[PDB]
Amino acid sequence: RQKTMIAEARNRKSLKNKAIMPRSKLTKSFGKMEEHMSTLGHDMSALQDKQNRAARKNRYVERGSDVVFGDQDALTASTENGVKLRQTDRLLDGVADGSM
Amino acid sequence: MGRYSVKRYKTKRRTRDLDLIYNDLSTKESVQKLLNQPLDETKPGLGQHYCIHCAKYMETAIALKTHLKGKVHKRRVKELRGVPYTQEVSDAAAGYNLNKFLNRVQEITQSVGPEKESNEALLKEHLDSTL
């Protein structure tokens, strides 16, 4: 187990070329947390309670915007040169219709 | 194989061997003969100032003194302490002439050893006095 941990640490670490990312800035997943705690042999009841509370707090409720524009797109003609509403188009301002 | 080892240990650039130097140091007469050499023009320092252990001539007495005050000479002296590794050592290591090798080692321990040590001490004090 000690030799295996040495090999895993060697494959993980690359300290000569760059630094390791900070854990205080990174975030990880509850599935990995649960499986690591299960490997360590702890009790996951409290952690599962916290995760269930977080999942029940994180709910998605539809609104009028989701009902009306959920699958729609555009609603405005895209310009040929990618210009704004009041931006002059040197090439195309003198031709009103798209056929011409 | 490499250039350094080739140009140092080429056959034509060979040096005197440890067993021969040990045999030279063993007897007082040989030490006296190597200390009192005829003046040879083909040797540095007219054949004088000759370190027997390193088998090396020096051009000057100060050169000999600086050589004695050096780690190379100390390394040679440390090498010349024990058995000089003749063919009998390898033969007995293989399992051949074991009694002959044991008798040789016993003779070295009893007779050759202390006399060679005393000759080395006399040579050391003579070099210290003359230098």
Binding site: K3, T4, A7, E8, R10, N11, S14 | -
Partner: protein
């Protein structure tokens, strides 16, 4: 057929005599060829952690033997030309010596 096995690959005899700037890329290509030989799949995908294991000691410092976990799985996309593909993962062990081909039970 979905399957998963563990192998030891001898990269030493596959990289014997290779120019130093090509050793790790040739190790990548040889591992792909190894997976194609053992699974019959033209589509072989290497894990980035496996790429790290290959490149750990620079461009010319590939290990003599590597312990690999090869999984033949199903290609779910319709636009893909092949129904199956191989996915190669590193098996970080104490040593890659004295190990035989084994089958991993998928749960």
């Amino acid at each position: 057929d979905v399957v998963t096995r563990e192998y030891t690959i001898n990269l030493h005899k596959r990289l014997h005599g290779v120019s130093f700037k090509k050793r790790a890329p040739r190790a990548v290509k040889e591992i792909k060829k190894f997976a194609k030989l053992h699974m019959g799949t033209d589509d072989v995908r290497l894990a980035p952690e496996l790429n790290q294991a290959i490149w750990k000691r620079g461009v010319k410092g590939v290990e003599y033997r590597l312990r690999l976990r090869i999984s033949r799985k199903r290609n779910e996309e319709e636009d893909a030309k092949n129904p199956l593909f191989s996915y190669v993962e590193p098996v970080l062990v104490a040593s890659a010596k004295g190990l035989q081909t084994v089958v991993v039970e998928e749960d």
